[PDB]
Every structure is written in structure tokens, then in C-alpha cells.
Amino acid sequence: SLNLDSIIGRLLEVQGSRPGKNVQLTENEIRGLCLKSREIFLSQPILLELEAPLKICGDIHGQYYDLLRLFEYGGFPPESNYLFLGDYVDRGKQSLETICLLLAYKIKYPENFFLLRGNHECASINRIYGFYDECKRRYNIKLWKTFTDCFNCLPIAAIVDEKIFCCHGGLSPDLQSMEQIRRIMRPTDVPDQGLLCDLLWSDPDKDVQGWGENDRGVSFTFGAEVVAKFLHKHDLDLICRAHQVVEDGYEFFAKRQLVTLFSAPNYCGEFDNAGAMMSVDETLMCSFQILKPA
Amino acid sequence: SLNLDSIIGRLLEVQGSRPGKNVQLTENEIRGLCLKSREIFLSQPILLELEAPLKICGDIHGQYYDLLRLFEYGGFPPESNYLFLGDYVDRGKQSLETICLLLAYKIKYPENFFLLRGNHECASINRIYGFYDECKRRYNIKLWKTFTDCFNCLPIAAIVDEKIFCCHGGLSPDLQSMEQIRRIMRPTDVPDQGLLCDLLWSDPDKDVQGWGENDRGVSFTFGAEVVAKFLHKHDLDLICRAHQVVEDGYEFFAKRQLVTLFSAPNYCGEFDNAGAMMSVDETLMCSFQILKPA
Amino acid sequence: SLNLDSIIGRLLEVQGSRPGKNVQLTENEIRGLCLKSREIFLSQPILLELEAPLKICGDIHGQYYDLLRLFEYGGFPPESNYLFLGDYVDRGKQSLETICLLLAYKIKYPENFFLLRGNHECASINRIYGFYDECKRRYNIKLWKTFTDCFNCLPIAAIVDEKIFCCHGGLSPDLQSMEQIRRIMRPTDVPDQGLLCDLLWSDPDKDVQGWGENDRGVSFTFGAEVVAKFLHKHDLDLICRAHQVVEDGYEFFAKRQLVTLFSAPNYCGEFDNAGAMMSVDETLMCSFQILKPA
Amino acid sequence: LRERKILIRFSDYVEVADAQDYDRRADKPWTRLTAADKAAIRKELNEFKSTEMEVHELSRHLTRFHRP
Amino acid sequence: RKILIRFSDYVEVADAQDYDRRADKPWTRLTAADKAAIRKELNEFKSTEMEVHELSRHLTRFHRP
Amino acid sequence: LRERKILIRFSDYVEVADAQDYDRRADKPWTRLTAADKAAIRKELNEFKSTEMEVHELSRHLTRFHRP
Amino acid sequence: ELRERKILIRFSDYVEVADAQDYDRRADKPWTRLTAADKAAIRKELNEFKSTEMEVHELSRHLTRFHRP
Ligand SMILES: [Mn+2]
Ligand SMILES: [Mn+2]
Ligand SMILES: [Mn+2]
Ligand SMILES: [Mn+2]
Ligand SMILES: [Mn+2]
Ligand SMILES: [Mn+2]
């Protein structure tokens, strides 16, 4: 059986060390994290219904030590409840530490800690952008296939107190009813087009009236009119998404009807961006706290 | 009806005999101790609110003749007020004599004699580490089930003069409010993880910034920073715990913001440690009295 | 019979870890460090005659990770030559790691690495101010007596290129000829008064014309004209000492004829001081590099 | 599209703290791939997703196969 | 924050009884079969015979088969 | 005193770097020594220095003994 | 600063790969059967060899790797 507190403990023990120090979990420990977390993801709806108080965070991309600082900043679980918006692995040098801690907290606090699926939580993408290479290097290929079964069961979106719609990428032209999301069955892959694809890939663009081309070569861009229509239709107040690096870690769109969240500061050591998280309180008052590079 | 003075007398009579000699209580007498003491535990809060003068002691682990000496040293009840921090049974050879004297003193001086629950005062642990075997050899399996119902009702923590927080193991990441301890209902088992587990199992560790792995494979370790923010949060001055063998019977941590107490000298005949008690007087002045192996 | 490179490697590889983490050397390895270094100390003069290039450092007081940071900054031996001015142990938490690395480097680079005796390298002082407690806790009392034997053999002062007189404390009224230092035989204790005491205990004072009272209750204070008279008589240009915390890590006295060096930044967590070292190149051009808290 | 009462509110106070300072520059292995590499990887995914990757019956139409 | 507690610098010392405290450690000789049987015993005991308040049943520490 | 030639020079450039950032505060138990403690330590130091600590024959007059 | 210095070296994305010979490379390890007396006798032989026979430049005699008796 799973030694959950030992795994979490070992993962936290690098606090105060210089970034880059690895955590050495065993193969069976990691497999255990995947199996039990997967089970939980499937026990909970694919469209999560969450309640404030809650802190919402965006991309991490294996910047494990920035995730630790983020917890230090906003409170380690269960001091705060957390909802992550995806893109835990790839690009960074420590995707395994990042996702293992996130999965372990899902198992420790399943009613107070939630993870959404990013476009990098699928086989085809994280086969190329680092996670596969990190699994094969430090353990083996089978472990990456085990992670894939877990990723294929991640929930795709969440509504906080019937007013904040959360997903990794954004809106879809194919999204006319929330039941369309609820009806998606897991485990599943991320398709190259369609509703699930857009939820993980689409981007807002000020220069687009409705829908437009996406420089990524996947999915679409969408404009402010799309957002306003969506919020009115479902009597929502805000779209909260991630997926794009923004200077202050958060960045509003369409008259504060949408916010982009990004939690990996100094992303890839190529940008000068802060990382942010949004706190929602019981009265639906939203505030931002950011970790800025010095 | 119960013959308490007779039990205490028989239990204290072996004082001066060769260590290892068995006090022979009857089956019915032992069940009387367990039932009456259980009643008292349940009539007092699970989070004790105590007042100095008081002497605080740590692990005994069935070293019955070391317990008799401890009472010689500090005064047989009610000469002094006592607070024990758990781990009365297991490992030692005379866990029955130890727990019977302690229960009997709880019935004798219920307002001046207090017992906290240790991690060995739970079924799964003392099933393996001796106490069960001791009960079966000298009596029957049912007597061990009777002790279990008594241990499941012990209080878990204690605050002395609103300034010294006492428990067996230490702090918990899930402990944000004293009310979380007060809402723990008895009788209860000790779980494999969570608040009640950590209160009986965690260990301080100077190497850990916040939380870390516990060599025991249960619960966590915690650092000076955790202790500091805890005392400041609840306006406490000290944490008093046991659980670990320390050379002098007492040992400070985080600039004397926490103290470990251990009262079983020459533990298991494997360490050359002293056993200690901590006296707290009306001034909240603390002093240490130790029994060292010669 | 000593694997010095394995010892040094273990001491240096905690670099990057959280400050406070220990290095586990065996008792016999530490004994080997002491006995071998002691032989080297005795084979070299009690008044060292050194040559630039050289980097001179002040107190460390067991702040092991600040010593590692110092070496990172100034260059790990033998990239730079080093002279330390004493007080390696006591007060800080990791005196054993500190002195073991310094002694290992003295054995490894005996012509490029030098340690002078501070007032805390004597049994009466470091019995009280922490080192003795550290040895008893991690090893045994006998090991402390082995360090005492090694400490009793340290050189007391050093002259760099016949122009910079170096000692931990300062001048003595009983210092008329350098021969008085030379004729001191080792192993020796530190007396309660007189030349060997003053050299490790005295302090400069601006408000003193000649000699004054020392608030330590030991030795004396001395004035700037005493410094100027001393330098003229022996044709020296600078007195380089430590013994006192100064805000910038280095602080001049007597019109830059005496400098205090202190290498423990944020000393005892009580001051907001920088730690400094002084570099003397081949031309006797001196320069300062400081590690400042942020 | 304006009478619709809004419930959410945003605080005008934004907390700012320092982020850790270390070298986040990372190696980009996907930039050393060749045309043949991608073909082998596409063959690998098709074989993995067809015969190994568990997929709910009602979601097999979402499995993202690749071109040879 | 103001601190009320104080510590006394006088440590009372006395002698502990001198006897052989070494004891057998039966748990070190448990086989896999033994552990499994004991996990079975505890699960049955805790399920049917151990009194647990209704609100603390989520804390009962059951064991794997 | 005024015209003695001086060889030493000081550079005007002071290099500055960041010291490590960690909690350096540490317990100071020696401030908690009783007169009985200090008497017991004084006796220990006297026995150790007089019967065990090696000292060159010409430096035994420097040995720092403590009052009873 | 380290990242702005010009680098000349380059690496090719194509790696040639051939099949190595397929034979049994298992070999004996005589050193694993040296007794304490054997090693002590070998240390004495090396010491005699290096002190009296092995040619060493005059300026490098301090590097000669002698062994514990
Ligand atoms: Mn991303
Ligand atoms: Mn993305
Ligand atoms: Mn115990
Ligand atoms: Mn315990
Ligand atoms: Mn000092
Ligand atoms: Mn000093």
C-alpha cells in the first residue's frame, strides 16, 4: 500500500535547497501515485463544481522549485484550497517532481485540491516536449505510459460557485451546452480538433471579432464578443484560463470578463514574467498575488 | 464495586522487590480500572486545559520499576500533579503493571493526574509490539480488547496555563485551529494519516524548513519555522512532547520553543539515556528533574 | 591511512543544500584530521612568515554555509591562498563541519592555507560557548579533548611580506620584540593575562590615547598612537585583525593603519553586518570583497 | 447584456512578492529531431494508442492518431 | 510578542534503578503469513467489536488483506 | 612617524555579493549556567588540564586554571 | 555573462549506428581473489620496484606512488 506522507515528505524536503536538486521516489511509489489519483479523478465529475474559498493557479511546466515557492506564498495544502489549470509537465527540467507533488496532494486532500488537464497532459504532446525524455531517463518507458493513463482521466473544466468557468485553453465554437462537457467519457485522448481540443488549446485575441486562426497550428482564437455572449448565456461572470505567458502573471480580456493566469515566472529563462494566482473568497471577491522576478 | 486502595497498594507493594516481579491483580479488578478510568477520560475534554503546579513526563514503555522510581523522585500522587504524554505500554516487560498504576492514579486523583494518548495506545501498534502478547500470556485476549476501549478514550492534547501545548508526537499540517482537536469525538482509533495521526507521530527535525519525511514511515517531520509560526498564531510559549529518546531525558528544539521529554531511562537496555520530568510552577517557571543511569 | 580527498569531497558536497545539513565523518576520520593537522601546525612557526598573494578572513564561528559561500566567492583552495584569523568554533551550529574543512585544507594545501589561533580555540572558552556541547552531542567528550590538543598547537600571529602583522585580537603592552612570540612553546594553553592572552583578546578603541579597559573583562584596549608607534618600531604598514563584528565586514582604524576583518555576515542573526575578506596581491595592493545580507 | 446583475468582484489590492532567482534556461531536445525521427515517433504513437492506451468505448473517436 | 514562560537553570539529578532492561523483540520474527493473519484479526476486531463513535468511523485504521 | 615610507596600498574598488539568506539565530545555553554548573565545569577543566591535557614543559605556567 | 560568449563547436543531429561484434566478453577478475598477505606482498614488491628500479625524472620523485607497508 501507498506511503503517501513519506512521498509528500520527501518531495517537500528539498525546500531551502538550491533549485535543481532532485527528489528520488521509487518506481512503485510513482506508480502508486498515478493509480490512486486516477481513481479519484474518475470518482469526481469531468466538469468540476467547486466552491470558494479557493486559489487558482496556471502553468508550471516542471519548474518544480517555483511551485514550492508558490505554495510557500499562498499556503501549503490544506491551509488553502487549490485548483490548477494544467500544463504541469514538459519544457522544465523537473516535470516528475512537479506532477508527483500535485498528484500526491490530490490524494491527500481530494475535496480541497483539484487539477485540470492542460494541452501538455496528453501523450502526443509530452512525448516530444520533455516529459517522456524525463521518464525514460530516470526510470523507464512504462512509467510514461502509466502517467498517460492518469492524464487521460484528468477533469477538463470547473465552475466555481456557478460564476467562474475554468479551463486550460478557452472557449470552443462547439461548446453550446455544459452537458457537452459532462458527457465526455474518460479515459480519453485529446483530439486534434473539436470540443476537448479547443478547451485545452484556444487563445483569446483582441484582433479577432469571433473566431480566427491560431498561430499554434491547433484550435482557434476567439474574441471579446464570444466571451460576452458565453457569460450571458450561462449566467457566468468570468472565464479563468491559462495557457499563455503574460507579463504580470495575470492579464484581463474583454472588459475583465476573462483572465489569463500563468504561474511559472521567468518562463524557460526566456521571458521576464511574473507568476500569479487568483484567490476567490466566500463572497466571490477575487484578488491576485504574484511572484515577480528580481 | 471497586477496591482501588487495594489495587494501588498491591501495585506499589512490589516497590523494593527485584524488578520483573509481577503484581497479581484479578481479571475483574483490571476491567474495573479500565471501565472507571474510561468514564473519567470521557468526562474531561479531549483537549485538556490544565493549571500549574504540574510535573510532565514522557514515554515509559512498560518499564514498570522505572515508573515506580519516577514517582519516588517527584512524589507519589497526590504529592505532585502529573501529566503523562503517552506510550505507557509495549517493548517493556511489565506494561500491565505500568498502565494499571497509571489508570488507578487517574481514578484516585482525577483532577491532579492526567494521561495523554501515545501512538502505542492504539490497537494496531500494541497488537505487535508486546502489550497484546503480555495480555494473552497473563490473562486473555478479551482483556486486551478492554484496554483498547480505554485507550480509544484518552485525551490527545493539553494546554497548561494557556501557554504550554502538550501532545505525544508533535504538530500537524492539518492543525489550523484548536477547535479541530476539540471536535474529535471519542472513542476513536488512531488513523493511518491526518490530524490525530500527526499529533501522535510527527517528529521535529532541524534539517526541514517546513514539512519533511519521517523515518518511521508514518506522518511527517517538521521544522523550527513551523513551530515558530504555531506558537505566535495561538499565543503559546512552548510545545511539550515526547515520542523520541533523548540523551538527557529532555532536549530543546527551535531555541527552546519546543521540548522533547523521555522518561524511560536506559531505554530497552539499548541506549544510555536518562529519563526526565518537567516541573511547571504557578509562576510558569519550568525546571527539569532527571533520573540518570549510574 | 587517511583518505583526505574523500573527506574533503563529503564536506564540500553539501553546497547547495539547505544551510544546517550535517556532514557525517567517522570518529577516526576526525581524529585523523586533528592529529595530522596538529603535526603540520607544530612543523611550522608559531609566528608565521607568509607571502602574497593571499586572502585574509575573520571570524566564522561555525557558520559553515557562510564559509562555503566565502570559498565560492574568493575561490576554493588552491585557487586562492588563504589566511584565517581564528574563532572557527562556538556560537554557530556547525563548528565541527567548519573546523574539519579548515583542517582538511591545511593538510591538503599546507603551504597555501593557514589558520591562526582565536580566543575560542582554547578549552576554557569553547567548553562553554558551544563547541564542547557539539562534540558530546554528535560524538563524545574524548573527541573534544583531541581538538583541544590540536588547537593548543596553532600559530598565534603572522607577518605577510614583512609589512602586515596579523592576529585575532590585537596588540599587547607586553609585546616589545617579535621574539617574545617566537619563544612561546607549543602545545600551550591561553593564559588569563599577558602577551598570549592580549594577542587573542585585545581590541582597539578610538577614545584611548594609550591603553584602556576592555569591556570583555579580559586583556585591554589600545589606542591609535599605540598602533602608530608599533608600526614605526617594526617598520610595518598594517595591523590586520578580527575579533569584532563590523558593519561592512571590514573597518579601518588609526588612519588605515589597522583594519578589522569579520567574515560572518548577519553575525549570530543579531547584526545586519556584511562578511568581508581582504586580498593582498604580489605588489602589496590590498582590496576588499564583501558578502552583504539582502 | 447590461441589466444582467454581476456577482463577481475584483479587489484593487494586488500582493507582490519576490520569485526565486535561479537559471531556468532549459535544453530543448525536440529541436534536434529529424524528419525520420518524427516518422518513427508517429509510428510509435499509433501503435501505442491502438493496442495499449486504454480508451473508453464512447471516446475512441477522440483518439489522436498520426500520419505515417 | 511578549513571552511569559521561564526556565530554571537548576537540573535535579538522581540515579535510576540499575537492572537489565534488554527485552526480546517478538515483532522482528513475524513472517508474511503472521502479518496477514494479524491484519485479518484487526479488521474483524475493529469492524464488529471495537466501539467507535459514529463521527469518528472515518478514522478507524483498517488494514490491507 | 610622518615620513616613514609605506609600501601597502588599498584599492578603491570594493566588490559586493549577496550572502546566503538563512536564519542564523542560535540558542545560547551558556547564559543559563548556574553557579553550581559553573563550579562543576571549573572542576572539570581543572582536572582535565592538570591530568590529561598535554602542555609543553616550558609553557605549563600559561595553563589557565579556574578557581574552586 | 557565461551565456553571451561565442561558441564555435556544433553538433550534428544525425547519429550513425552500426552493430558491434557479438561474442562473449566475460573475463576473469584475479584481483578479487587477493588475500591480505598477497596485497602486503604486492605492496612490498612495488615499493622495492619503485625505489630501486623504476626510472623517474629527478623533478618528479615526489609523485612516485608508494604503498603502505
Ligand atoms: Mn503551457
Ligand atoms: Mn498550454
Ligand atoms: Mn515510544
Ligand atoms: Mn511514541
Ligand atoms: Mn569571535
Ligand atoms: Mn574573538
Author numbering:
A (entry chain K), B (entry chain I), C (entry chain P): 6 to 57, 60, 60A, 60B, 61 to 299
D (entry chain X), F (entry chain W): 513 to 580
E (entry chain U): 516 to 580
G (entry chain V): 512 to 580
Can you quote the paper on this entry?
The three Protein Phosphatase 1 (PP1) isoforms regulate diverse cellular processes, acting in partnership with over 200 different PP1-interacting proteins (PIPs). The four Phosphatase and actin regulator (Phactr) proteins are novel PIPs that are implicated in cytoskeletal regulation in animal models and cell culture settings. Here, we show that Phactr1 confers sequence-specificity on the Phactr1/PP1 holoenzyme. We show that efficient catalysis requires interactions between conserved hydrophobic residues in the substrate and a novel Phactr1-PP1 composite surface, which comprises a hydrophobic pocket and associated amphipathic cavity with a surrounding basic rim.
